[PDB]
Design a protein around this nucleic acid. Structure first.
Ligand code: SF4
Ligand SMILES: [Mn+2]
Length: 187
RNA sequence: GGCGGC
DNA sequence: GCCGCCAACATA
């Protein structure tokens, strides 16, 4: 039911901070390192994109990197298809859970995947928070949670704020969960 | 990105 | 240099 020229907006309204970052990085750089391609792609699949859309969404954005639209089908295409289970063993991979994102494959320079509340240093996170126009009160309330390593909670806090609600009404532990709950209130 | 093949 | 095959796991 979801369309491609709608994502940019969705990223702002329903994507959790992690997917939002990964999306912006993809539009700015017209590319993403493996770690981000994994987390983001499975997420996009989890929200609704079909294999036809996925291949289009990614090819389109990668041509702007000015690389061979052929050098794309060479490497990147096969892997996208294997994500939707259309290659090899044929496994329709479930998107990443928060705990996984938070405790594994920590990000390094050049990477944008991972969990902002966990992998972005307090000072950079603050700037992002502000960039999303989050009230300095909640920003402060988030940083606290972050300091107590309650990353997922801090993200729930972010939910409640960007949706103007008192209680998100669920415990967060999967990015696409954040998405759906958002879609519930907006759509 | 890793592993694997030439 | 060409290429194949993987990983995940919430979820009402
Ligand atoms: S809480 Fe889970 S989803 Fe919300 S940002 Fe941290 S990782 Fe991505
Ligand atoms: Mn590569």
């Amino acid at each position: 039911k979801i369309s491609l020229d709608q994502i940019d907006l969705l990223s702002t309204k329903s994507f959790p901070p992690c997917m939002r970052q990964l999306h912006k990085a993809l539009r700015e750089n017209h590319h993403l390192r493996h770690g981000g391609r994994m987390q983001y792609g499975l997420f996009l699949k989890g929200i609704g994109l079909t294999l036809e859309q996925a291949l289009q969404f990614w090819k389109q954005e990668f041509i702007k990197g000015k690389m061979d639209p052929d050098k794309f089908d060479k490497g990147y295409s096969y892997n996208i298809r294997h994500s939707f289970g259309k290659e090899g063993k044929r496994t329709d991979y479930t998107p990443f859970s928060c705990l996984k994102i938070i405790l594994s494959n920590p990000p390094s320079q050049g990477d944008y995947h991972g969990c902002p509340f966990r992998h972005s240093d307090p000072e950079l996170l603050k700037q992002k928070l502000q960039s999303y126009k989050i009230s300095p009160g909640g920003i402060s309330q988030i940083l606290d949670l972050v300091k107590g390593t309650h990353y997922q909670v801090a993200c729930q806090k972010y939910f409640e704020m960007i949706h103007n609600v008192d209680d998100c009404g669920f415990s967060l532990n999967h990015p696409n969960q954040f998405f759906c709950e958002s879609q519930r209130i907006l759509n």
